[PDB]
């Protein structure tokens, strides 16, 4: 399904598994490092050892996670980059 990532207090990659996101609090993103499941808003505060503590972070809202989680850079252009992009928009638009 979805190859996902974020660059918050470090960076992290994961797997969005659409079929599991069936409630605002449903851990549906799985870290591609610890392999654990994360609810979209907790996944955004989960970087692995990537730290980034000598830079001041302004406006980080965990609730603003729909602006943080992005589609992997794994550009296979064609209509998969667009198809999966449209499915990522659907995930975002659902419990708001």
Partner 1 sequence: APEYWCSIAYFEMDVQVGETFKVPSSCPIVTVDGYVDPSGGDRFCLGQLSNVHRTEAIERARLHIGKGVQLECKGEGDVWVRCLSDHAVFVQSYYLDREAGRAPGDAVHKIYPSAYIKVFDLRQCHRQMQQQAATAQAAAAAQVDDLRRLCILRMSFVKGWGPDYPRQSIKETPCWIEIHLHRALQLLDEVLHTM
β-sheet bridge partners, residue 4? 14, 71
Residue 82 in the binding site for partner 1 (CB under 8 A): no
Instruction: Pick one of 35, 49, 57, 78: the residue that binds partner 1 (CB under 8 A).
Output: 57
Provide the sign of the torsion angle of the four alpha carbons 72, 59, 48, 54, taken in this order.
positive
Stretch that binds partner 1, among 11-19, 61-69, 76-84, 88-96 (CB under 8 A): 61-69
Stretch that binds partner 1, among 14-22, 28-36, 50-58, 76-84 (CB under 8 A): 50-58
At 61, list the tokens: 């809202």
Binding partner at 54 among partner 1, Zn ion, none, C-beta below 5 to 8 Å by kind: partner 1
Instruction: Pick one of 1, 10, 27, 33: the residue that binds Zn ion (CB under 5 A).
Output: 33
Three-state SS for 88?
helix
- C-alpha dihedral, 51 to 55 to 57 to 62, nearest 10°: 0
């Amino acid at each position: 399904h979805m190859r996902v990532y974020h660059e918050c207090f470090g960076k992290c990659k994961g797997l969005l598994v659409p079929e599991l996101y069936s409630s605002p609090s449903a851990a549906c993103i799985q870290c591609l490092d610890c392999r654990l499941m994360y609810p979209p808003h907790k996944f955004v505060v989960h970087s692995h050892k990537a730290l980034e503590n000598r830079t001041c972070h302004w406006g980080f809202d965990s609730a603003n996670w729909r602006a943080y989680i992005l589609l992997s850079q794994d550009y296979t252009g064609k209509e998969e980059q667009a198809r999966l992009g449209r499915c990522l928009d659907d995930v975002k638009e659902k419990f708001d």
